[PDB]
Structures are given as structure tokens and as C-alpha cells.
A paper describes a structure:
Protein stability can be fine‐tuned by modifying different structural features such as hydrogen‐bond networks, salt bridges, hydrophobic cores, or disulfide bridges. Among these, stabilization by salt bridges is a major challenge in protein design and engineering since their stabilizing effects show a high dependence on the structural environment in the protein, and therefore are difficult to predict and model. In this work, we explore the effects on structure and stability of an introduced salt bridge cluster in the context of three different de novo TIM barrels. The results show that despite the similarities in protein fold, the salt bridge clusters differently influence the structural and stability properties of the de novo TIM barrel variants depending on the structural background where they are introduced.
The salt bridge variants exhibit similar thermostability in comparison with their parental designs but important differences in the conformational stability at 25°C can be observed such as a highly stabilizing effect for two of the proteins but a destabilizing effect to the third. Analysis of the formed geometries of the salt bridge cluster in the crystal structures show either highly ordered salt bridge clusters or only single salt bridges. Rosetta modeling of the salt bridge clusters results in a good prediction of the tendency on stability changes but not the geometries observed in the three‐dimensional structures.
Residue numbers in the entry: 4 to 45, 51 to 92, 98 to 185
Amino acid sequence: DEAWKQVEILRRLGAKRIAYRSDDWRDLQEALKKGADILIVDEAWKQVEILRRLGAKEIAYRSDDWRDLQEALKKGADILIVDAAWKQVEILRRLGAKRIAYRSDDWRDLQEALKKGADILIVDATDKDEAWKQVEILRRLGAKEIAYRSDDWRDLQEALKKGADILIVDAT
């Protein structure tokens, strides 16, 4: 409901890179004011446009349609989220994407996406302990910008302790 409160807690607990995912631009705008650094917009380009006009400098957009991804970029979206092959990261950069986030449940897949120029590696595995291990594996390999998502700030805090650089607060 009011998830921006989770951003405050993680801020005070030493989270330097916090993202906020929501389908309400006002909910997203309020999160930016509470310390959120990345606004993930889940017809949704009207949101990235508003947040862009409201001074947001790190808007992410996810979608399976590339005409949709392309429209989001034109409206201001700085980050584009690919959900798992890694062979489309370079293809996506040609569309004009300044930053590419790659979501996958396997660390090998994420490392492959990192070699192709992916800037952000989102760990999204079924189990929580299995997700922890993938963060740990990527951290050991030196992967920069490891991201983990959860609607429980305690899991996010644990993620940060395991090696996650970006904590995605999932608002709902």
C-alpha cells in the first residue's frame, strides 16, 4: 500500500541505491522524494513522461513489446528491463537505451548478459535462499550493479548483506 515507508527504513539502514516499482506515478513520485533513486514504471509511457517532467533522472521501463520500449525511451526512460536472452542487449542498445537491466533466475545467464553490456543484473529466483546464492556468486565474480526485488524490506536488507547493490522495493 504505502511502500515508500520501506524506502525510508532501508535508507536509514545504509542502502545507497534504492529502486521503487509501482504502477502509480504519484506513488512513484512520492518515493523519489523519500530517497528512491530509480523509479520502475511497470499506455504506461504517460507515466515516464510525467515523472520525467517532474525532475526524475532515473526512470526504468519494462515490457515485452519493443515498440513499447522504444516509446518509453522517447518519453524519457533511462533504463530498459529485459526479462529472460542475453543476445538482445546489444540489439537493445541500438534502439537508444542508455542503460540496460537484465532479469534472470540463473547466474550464468546474468553473467552472459553482463558480458554483452548489461548494466544492471536483477536476480529473480523462486526460492529466497537460491536468490541469495546467485547474488553471492555474481558478487564473487565482480558483477557491478546487482539488483534484488522484494516487498519485504528485511529480505532486501539481507540481500544488501549478501552483495546486492540495488534494492528494488516492490510496491503493491
